[PDB]
Amino acid sequence: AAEIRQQFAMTAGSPIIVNDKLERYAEVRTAFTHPTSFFKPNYKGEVKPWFLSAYDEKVRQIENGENGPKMKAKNVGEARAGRALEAAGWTLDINYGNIYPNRFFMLWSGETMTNTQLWAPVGLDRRPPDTTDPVELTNYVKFAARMAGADLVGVARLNRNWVYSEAVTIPADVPYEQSLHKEIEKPIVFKDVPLPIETDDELIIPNTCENVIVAGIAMNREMMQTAPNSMACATTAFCYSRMCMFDMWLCQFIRYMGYYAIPSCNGVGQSVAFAVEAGLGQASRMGACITPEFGPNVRLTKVFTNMPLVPDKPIDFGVTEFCETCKKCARECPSKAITEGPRTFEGRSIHNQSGKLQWQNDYNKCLGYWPESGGYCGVCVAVCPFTKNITEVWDGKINTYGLDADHFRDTVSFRKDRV
Amino acid sequence: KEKNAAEIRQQFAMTAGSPIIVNDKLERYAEVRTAFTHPTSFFKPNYKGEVKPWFLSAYDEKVRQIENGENGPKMKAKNVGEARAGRALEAAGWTLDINYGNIYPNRFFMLWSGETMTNTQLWAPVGLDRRPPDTTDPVELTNYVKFAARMAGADLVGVARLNRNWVYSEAVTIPADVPYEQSLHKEIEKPIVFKDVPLPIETDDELIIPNTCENVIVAGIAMNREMMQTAPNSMACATTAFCYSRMCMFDMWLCQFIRYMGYYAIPSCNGVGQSVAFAVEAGLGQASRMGACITPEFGPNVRLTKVFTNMPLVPDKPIDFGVTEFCETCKKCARECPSKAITEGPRTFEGRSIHNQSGKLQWQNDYNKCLGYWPESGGYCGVCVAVCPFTKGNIWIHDGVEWLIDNTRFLNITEVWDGKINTYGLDADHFRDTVSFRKDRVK
Ligand SMILES: Oc1ccc(Br)cc1Br
Ligand SMILES: Oc1ccc(Br)cc1Br
Ligand SMILES: Oc1ccc(Br)cc1Br
Ligand SMILES: Oc1ccc(Br)cc1Br
Ligand code: SF4
Ligand code: SF4
Ligand code: SF4
Ligand code: SF4
Ligand SMILES: [Br-]
To answer: Which of residues 363-402 of A touch B (CB under 8 A)?
Structure first.
């Protein structure tokens, strides 16, 4: 796979085409959070926050021995098991995505972490960097990223166009039990300051924050192929906890090297754009970043840092041209969310960021199918050619973290492919 | 014939029964007696002769090595930047671990109930932790829980009935009102007792495990071979450290799955009881001269954690693939040990010192001598693991009829940073060893 990636390397330069209308995008506009999309009826006709309506459908399916919408399970025991696996997968994730910056697991400084306090006598986080060479730092930090659970890792210069204009967060002293009821907006700004810092009014990223490190965290193929049923929910969930552990591990390594690091998971900015600029893959009709190793069946997280690094080259292995004629995801999508038309610079609704050339999809239509089906769908990922019953999954092949030994050698790494 | 770990385990399976041989002087072991915690072993000199808590003396040596451009004792790094990078990797590995091992029960990550966890609160409307189990069949439960264990990062997973002999008589913990920044100064002992109660519970006086807590699930978490072979230097410390955070994630993930199936679950990592003995009884491997559990897939180069539960399960069979007989003639770890902690003599029932639990047949090692080498070397050593022939990736051969051990096996850090790596430090040349189907999860 290291041969393929260098064969398809582009010359330097962001491959996302923009016009002069593009503005940074307020995170509150996503379908998950925006008031126009947030409330959906359950199967009884009661309007609730969308994820609560989806909970009601999970309960109804368990009671009726189903693994998904009109998908009978082997028995009620099997239906329960898939939802127990899904729920457990989310253990290391706050409120579905860890999006609040500088809260809970997503701290912008390591100073208060238990690990940092235990290691304080060594002083790694206070000691100036011993390495400033971007070539050596790129090799060190990619090695560390693989130790930290990334299946893919890439580096790009930080394009501020993809950083949210304002983040969704909670006040710093609000306890977890009131968090969902007290979400607020807060601007993300760049200023001449030494370190990332949060004031009462602003999330402040330093102007020295030059780079973003993007990780790809592979999902399980057999489980995602059960979309829109529960086992596709389970591989999604487990990878969100893998994302959180990756951010914390890598931020701690970068801090202990003498630099600062900002974790993010699903917060701070748009992962698909960063992933394309870092060379992990190409944008697609469904909207995801499609990778040569995994297609779109991979989750993304990212870390921002002033650590000197060598940016990776973007890659072109023909996704744009394949998506022009394929349209399989658009035809299988249960909610008709994915367009069959051509790419434009004009968003279809508030949930899209206008000003960038992309396939414009209706993401309120997508979210609307989640309470109906009681899961996170994923049909588009499952049917995509680049990605290539539930009892057979539970009785079938599995390996550590759901990785597959039949393909795991595609992500082996030596120095030559790290820098 | 190409390697097959399921075949190897089937060939060397033994009939049911704890393989560990015990006599009448066996008593449960107070966790405070470990060398990490006991007053007789806790204090060690640093390189200036100052007597400190052992891990602070080791800190002093780490700082000294970075300043002198060293990756380990008298091992020169490429430069100071490389020395710094190895210790930064090591320190970051420990991010999801409290005070080196997560040993305090029902504190921090090791909660004995899920009710207060953020994930449980988020999922409360579904009621999975309050709904009675929909499956009580131990066969199906074993398949489900082992599948979940592999999702949760276990490279090996096994089940045994819980043997209370290996549960610590008293735990090392902290009072519930002590915050993290004073934890190291306020450690106490607290008894672990078994009583007729419905759920695991902690009182001011006791940690109470229910009499219904029938089973223990043991996980192996594979370390990286290239990094451990640098023992006693810094990169061996780093693969150790990352695997402790993997252990913690495993426990939390699996306990939540078990709870959401309608049962209770107790995490432990390095706490609650003796991992090697549980691992032997659950069939992950055999005890060895060095004292670790040696597995067919990884040798001793694998970490262990375990979860206790009332969930009905099918215990696995123990395995005997000849480790005892190899250790009887090998002695490589004993001869290479930089502190001479590992005995070259026979197994006995008599502990060498307070750190050993007497009354069980094992090789008796001086674990105060081992720990004394850690401040000297600035790390967690691991030379015994590195030199053990079972840590080699290719010890197994097939003779056309069956599998056997290759007896011939018993006769630098810059290149590691520049060399092969893959997700979580796993090795794709060997990752097929741990593929799993229903047939090898439950019989
Ligand atoms: O990104 C997500 C946010 C919330 C839920 Br519920 C599922 C996903 Br996937
Ligand atoms: O006295 C101490 C100071 C720092 C640490 Br880290 C541990 C102890 Br004990
Ligand atoms: O088990 C351990 C406890 C403390 C340290 Br420091 C290292 C290990 Br390995
Ligand atoms: O009102 C609520 C009740 C339970 C949960 Br979980 C989330 C909300 Br918002
Ligand atoms: S997740 Fe499902 S509903 Fe959403 S776009 Fe994909 S196929 Fe359509
Ligand atoms: S299914 Fe086809 S059109 Fe959709 S993202 Fe995949 S390749 Fe592109
Ligand atoms: S860790 Fe090192 S000092 Fe300890 S027993 Fe093994 S070889 Fe000896
Ligand atoms: S080095 Fe030899 S004696 Fe020591 S544990 Fe390994 S096989 Fe046994
Ligand atoms: Br202490």
So the answer is: 394-402
